[PDB]
Design a protein around this motif. Structure first.
Motif, mmCIF file in Angstrom:
data_model
loop_
_atom_site.group_PDB
_atom_site.id
_atom_site.type_symbol
_atom_site.label_atom_id
_atom_site.label_comp_id
_atom_site.label_asym_id
_atom_site.label_seq_id
_atom_site.Cartn_x
_atom_site.Cartn_y
_atom_site.Cartn_z
ATOM 1 N N UNK A 1 103.537 -26.198 56.178
ATOM 2 C CA UNK A 1 102.640 -26.406 55.041
ATOM 3 C C UNK A 1 101.282 -26.845 55.580
ATOM 4 N N UNK A 2 100.403 -27.281 54.676
ATOM 5 C CA UNK A 2 99.017 -27.567 55.030
ATOM 6 C C UNK A 2 98.887 -28.983 55.580
ATOM 7 N N UNK A 3 99.178 -29.987 54.748
ATOM 8 C CA UNK A 3 99.151 -31.402 55.136
ATOM 9 C C UNK A 3 97.774 -31.786 55.692
ATOM 10 N N UNK A 4 96.790 -31.762 54.789
ATOM 11 C CA UNK A 4 95.382 -31.871 55.161
ATOM 12 C C UNK A 4 95.088 -33.172 55.904
ATOM 13 N N UNK A 5 94.134 -33.093 56.832
ATOM 14 C CA UNK A 5 93.837 -34.169 57.772
ATOM 15 C C UNK A 5 92.693 -35.011 57.225
ATOM 16 N N UNK A 6 92.879 -36.343 57.252
ATOM 17 C CA UNK A 6 92.008 -37.437 56.806
ATOM 18 C C UNK A 6 91.121 -37.128 55.594
ATOM 19 N N UNK A 7 91.700 -36.799 54.423
ATOM 20 C CA UNK A 7 90.880 -36.715 53.209
ATOM 21 C C UNK A 7 90.831 -38.042 52.467
ATOM 22 N N UNK A 8 91.214 -39.120 53.153
ATOM 23 C CA UNK A 8 91.368 -40.424 52.523
ATOM 24 C C UNK A 8 90.033 -40.957 52.017
ATOM 25 N N UNK A 9 90.096 -41.699 50.917
ATOM 26 C CA UNK A 9 88.907 -42.244 50.284
ATOM 27 C C UNK A 9 88.416 -43.483 51.034
ATOM 28 N N UNK A 10 87.256 -43.972 50.614
ATOM 29 C CA UNK A 10 86.620 -45.137 51.215
ATOM 30 C C UNK A 10 85.843 -45.854 50.116
ATOM 31 N N UNK A 11 84.938 -46.742 50.505
ATOM 32 C CA UNK A 11 84.113 -47.427 49.529
ATOM 33 C C UNK A 11 83.348 -48.564 50.163
ATOM 34 N N UNK A 12 82.415 -49.106 49.377
ATOM 35 C CA UNK A 12 81.625 -50.247 49.779
ATOM 36 C C UNK A 12 81.788 -51.395 48.795
ATOM 37 N N UNK A 13 81.234 -52.546 49.173
ATOM 38 C CA UNK A 13 81.314 -53.757 48.366
ATOM 39 C C UNK A 13 79.903 -54.285 48.137
ATOM 40 N N UNK A 14 79.625 -54.709 46.905
ATOM 41 C CA UNK A 14 78.347 -55.300 46.537
ATOM 42 C C UNK A 14 78.601 -56.594 45.779
ATOM 43 N N UNK A 15 77.729 -57.577 45.985
ATOM 44 C CA UNK A 15 77.874 -58.903 45.398
ATOM 45 C C UNK A 15 76.699 -59.153 44.466
ATOM 46 N N UNK A 16 76.998 -59.585 43.243
ATOM 47 C CA UNK A 16 75.990 -59.918 42.246
ATOM 48 C C UNK A 16 76.125 -61.400 41.930
ATOM 49 N N UNK A 17 75.042 -62.151 42.129
ATOM 50 C CA UNK A 17 75.060 -63.589 41.906
ATOM 51 C C UNK A 17 73.638 -64.067 41.660
ATOM 52 N N UNK A 18 73.450 -65.106 40.842
ATOM 53 C CA UNK A 18 72.117 -65.703 40.705
ATOM 54 C C UNK A 18 71.805 -66.656 41.848
ATOM 55 N N UNK A 19 70.678 -67.360 41.757
ATOM 56 C CA UNK A 19 70.316 -68.306 42.789
ATOM 57 C C UNK A 19 71.256 -69.495 42.844
ATOM 58 N N UNK A 20 71.290 -70.133 44.017
ATOM 59 C CA UNK A 20 72.184 -71.266 44.233
ATOM 60 C C UNK A 20 71.781 -72.491 43.425
ATOM 61 N N UNK A 21 70.513 -72.592 43.023
ATOM 62 C CA UNK A 21 70.081 -73.727 42.213
ATOM 63 C C UNK A 21 70.670 -73.674 40.808
ATOM 64 N N UNK A 22 70.862 -72.473 40.260
ATOM 65 C CA UNK A 22 71.390 -72.344 38.906
ATOM 66 C C UNK A 22 72.907 -72.499 38.883
ATOM 67 N N UNK A 23 73.618 -71.624 39.589
ATOM 68 C CA UNK A 23 75.075 -71.651 39.615
ATOM 69 C C UNK A 23 75.547 -71.044 40.931
ATOM 70 N N UNK A 24 76.853 -70.778 41.018
ATOM 71 C CA UNK A 24 77.430 -70.206 42.229
ATOM 72 C C UNK A 24 78.434 -69.094 41.943
ATOM 73 N N UNK A 25 78.563 -68.653 40.694
ATOM 74 C CA UNK A 25 79.489 -67.579 40.367
ATOM 75 C C UNK A 25 79.001 -66.252 40.941
ATOM 76 N N UNK A 26 79.957 -65.407 41.333
ATOM 77 C CA UNK A 26 79.662 -64.129 41.965
ATOM 78 C C UNK A 26 80.394 -63.019 41.224
ATOM 79 N N UNK A 27 79.867 -61.804 41.364
ATOM 80 C CA UNK A 27 80.472 -60.606 40.799
ATOM 81 C C UNK A 27 80.579 -59.551 41.888
ATOM 82 N N UNK A 28 81.768 -58.976 42.040
ATOM 83 C CA UNK A 28 82.038 -57.975 43.068
ATOM 84 C C UNK A 28 81.900 -56.585 42.455
ATOM 85 N N UNK A 29 81.284 -55.670 43.204
ATOM 86 C CA UNK A 29 81.020 -54.319 42.734
ATOM 87 C C UNK A 29 81.399 -53.316 43.815
ATOM 88 N N UNK A 30 81.892 -52.161 43.376
ATOM 89 C CA UNK A 30 82.215 -51.045 44.253
ATOM 90 C C UNK A 30 81.372 -49.841 43.859
#
Ligand SMILES: *[C@@H]1O[C@H](CO)[C@@H](O)[C@H](O)[C@H]1NC(C)=O
Lengths: 100, 50, 49, 49
Positions: A71-100
């Protein structure tokens, strides 16, 4: 002893035949001496009998011909991705939001 | 064991054209919907075939 | 190559090229086995370049 | 298409170099590939700027 590498299929290999094919899992493999990591799924590509492995534009292996299974059994078509962080300044708060 | 033939007619060879003949696969790799250039033995187009 | 490493008392990789210890996972193609006998220090003459 | 270049090596895949070449010189070959692709990336970045 000359050990040149050709595009023709290898008629000699080391005795390391074990395990079995696993589908839909991003696992590592060393098919025909080529190390890689990706999922093992199917596709609708029609493969001629003399064709063993395919290549993309970037000359990266994306297809193989598994011996004794064919059969075919295709080679490395595997997915990937990155990570992004959304947060305000440290003086206001410290909560973070994760994004792909 | 062979038999000689003496009925052969003398005729110089003729030449015709080879417009779009003499193309094959230089490698067995599977490439789809792409353009690739390879250096290999190839019969030239519009050559002079006997 | 595992049995061939002890079949004969040959020199253990006095050459440059493929990885010696990893030779099990080499699926090479189209070897050319040429055997001949030489004299003296002509072993160093058989080198690339 | 720049990923298909060899930059003077024997293969365009780092896995083949790692599994087919002795690590003392495989490290140098990998460094050469890394700096060649870094030069290509720098050229691309300058063109983008
Ligand atoms: C092919 O060669 C013959 C003689 O060698 C010549 O008469 C003819 O014009 C040639 N044809 C072409 C297309 O070159």
């Amino acid at each position: 002893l000359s050990f040149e590498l050709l595009h023709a299929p290898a008629t000699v290999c080391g005795p390391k035949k074990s395990t079995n094919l696993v589908k839909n899992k991003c696992v590592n493999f060393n098919f025909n001496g080529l190390k890689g990591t990706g999922v093992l799924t199917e596709s609708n590509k029609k493969f001629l009998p003399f064709q063993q492995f395919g290549r993309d534009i970037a000359d990266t292996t994306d297809a193989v011909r598994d011996p004794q299974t064919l059969e075919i059994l295709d080679i490395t078509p595997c997915s990937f991705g990155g990570v992004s962080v959304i947060t305000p300044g440290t003086n206001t708060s410290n909560q973070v939001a994760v994004l792909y | 064991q062979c038999v000689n033939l003496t009925t052969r007619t003398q005729l110089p060879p003729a030449y015709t054209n080879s417009f779009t003949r003499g193309v094959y696969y230089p490698d067995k790799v599977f490439r789809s919907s792409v353009l690739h250039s390879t250096q290999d033995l190839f019969l030239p187009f519009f050559s002079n075939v006997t | 190559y595992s049995v061939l490493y002890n079949l004969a008392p040959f020199f253990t990789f006095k050459c440059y090229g493929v990885s010696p210890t990893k030779l099990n996972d080499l699926c090479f193609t189209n070897v050319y086995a040429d055997s001949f006998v030489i004299r003296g220090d002509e072993v160093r003459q058989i080198a690339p370049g | 298409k720049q990923l298909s270049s060899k930059f003077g090596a024997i293969s365009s895949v780092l896995n083949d170099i790692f599994s087919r070449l002795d690590p003392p010189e495989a490290e140098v070959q990998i460094d050469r590939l890394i700096t060649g692709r870094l030069q290509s990336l720098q050229t691309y970045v300058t063109q983008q700027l």
